Amino acid sequence: RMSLQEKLLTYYRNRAAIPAGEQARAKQAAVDICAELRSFLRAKLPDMPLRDMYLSGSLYDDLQVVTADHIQLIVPLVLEQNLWSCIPGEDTIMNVPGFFLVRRENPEYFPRGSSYWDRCVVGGYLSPKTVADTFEKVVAGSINWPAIGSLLDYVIRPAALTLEVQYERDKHLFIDFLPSVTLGDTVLVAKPHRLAQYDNLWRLSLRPAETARLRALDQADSGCRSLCLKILKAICKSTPALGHLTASQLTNVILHLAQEEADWSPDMLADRFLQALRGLISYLEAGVLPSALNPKVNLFAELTPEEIDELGYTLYCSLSEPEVLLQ
Numbered sequence: 001r002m003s004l005q006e007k008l009l010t011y012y013r014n015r016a017a018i019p020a021g022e023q024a025r026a027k028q029a030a031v032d033i034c035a036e037l038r039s040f041l042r043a044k045l046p047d048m049p050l051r052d053m054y055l056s057g058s059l060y061d062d063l064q065v066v067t068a069d070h071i072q073l074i075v076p077l078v079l080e081q082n083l084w085s086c087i088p089g090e091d092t093i094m095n096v097p098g099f100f101l102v103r104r105e106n107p108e109y110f111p112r113g114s115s116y117w118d119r120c121v122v123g124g125y126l127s128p129k130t131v132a133d134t135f136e137k138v139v140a141g142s143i144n145w146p147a148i149g150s151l152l153d154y155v156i157r158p159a160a161l162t163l164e165v166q167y168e169r170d171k172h173l174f175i176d177f178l179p180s181v182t183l184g185d186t187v188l189v190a191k192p193h194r195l196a197q198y199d200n201l202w203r204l205s206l207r208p209a210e211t212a213r214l215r216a217l218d219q220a221d222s223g224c225r226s227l228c229l230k231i232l233k234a235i236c237k238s239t240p241a242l243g244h245l246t247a248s249q250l251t252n253v254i255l256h257l258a259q260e261e262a263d264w265s266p267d268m269l270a271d272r273f274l275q276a277l278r279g280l281i282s283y284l285e286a287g288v289l290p291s292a293l294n295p296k297v298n299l300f301a302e303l304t305p306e307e308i309d310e311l312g313y314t315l316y317c318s319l320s321e322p323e324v325l326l327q
């Protein structure tokens with residue numbers, strides 16, 4: 001009979017880990033499109049204030065699990081300090097940490113037209129929706145995907161902000177464009193809040209710091225923090241009743257545990273996995289999962305009380321059903 005340690009490594013091998021060739025070729029296809037858009041953007045849209053779009057997401061980080069089929073292209077707006085301010089959610093009437101307003105400064109003094117992005121402002125705030133609608137239309141209006149693909153031998157076709165890239169004749173990858181804004185030390189992305197009434201808010205960007213801290217910890221001591229995370233990701237992705245859980249939530253569960261446990265030797269994987277599980281359950285029971293980097297942010301905040309309850313129950317039930325959890 002197998003130890004839990006072995007069952008987890010077996011599971012990772014057979015289910016979580018992407019075939020290494022697929023992982024590299026998928027990622028390289030995304031890298032290829034990125035560079036070609038780098039040239040296009042300069043040549044075609046000098047009008048629009050942006051920097052070079054860059055890749056982001058698990059696929060780029062060797063953190064994607066089960067299958068290599070998605071990655072983000074960050075579309076980084078250039079905003080000048082004088083014209084824009086970001087308001088933290090705790091200071092808005094919405095009162096939601098982890099989300100910001102992007103306020104256009106004093107239009108009596110800086111009239112509409114002082115920035116290209118004035119055309120995406122609503123009621124004095126830069127709109128995440130509108131920025132994304134606007135960018136979509138302006139790229140569509142000048143981009144020739146058929147010749148880009150022709151160039152790279154990829155077949156590329158938009159779905160709206162999502163490209164389906166057919167790199168090998170039988171393989172695909174989805175690239176979606178994620179508008180971003182950096183004001184001072186704050187990085188935001190146009191990833192909408194779940195609820196419509198919060199649709200004026202930009203989302204605080206957490207992933208890069210989180211995943212960097214995860215790498216730093218693992219690199220320093222050669223630990224299994226990333227391996228444990230990927231297993232957790234594959235389980236949640238593979239289990240329908242767990243669909244609500246996110247990679248960011250799981251990563252922060254790991255980060256909290258790492259603050260209390262120094263030994264993440266390969267031999268402790270089983271023990272840490274169990275702590276992670278019992279940790280996740282407990283956060284759900286309290287209905288609060290603080291961000292390890294921004295403890296004011298509750299990562300369960302977009303989950304209803306009943307959804308959190310069913311997540312907790314599903315996980316408690318799975319303790320008796322290890323073979324369904326590791327299918």
Ligand SMILES: Nc1ncnc2c1ncn2[C@@H]1O[C@H](COP(=O)(O)OP(=O)(O)O)[C@@H](O)[C@H]1O
Pocket residue numbers: 056057058059063064065072074178189191204205206207208233246247248
């Ligand atoms: N630089 C970034 N800042 C904030 N959010 C991001 C960034 N890059 C990707 N995301 C968001 O994170 C989510 C994907 O996270 P990821 O770590 O790739 O999890 P998964 O492997 O489950 O896709 C997406 O919803 C995406 O929009």
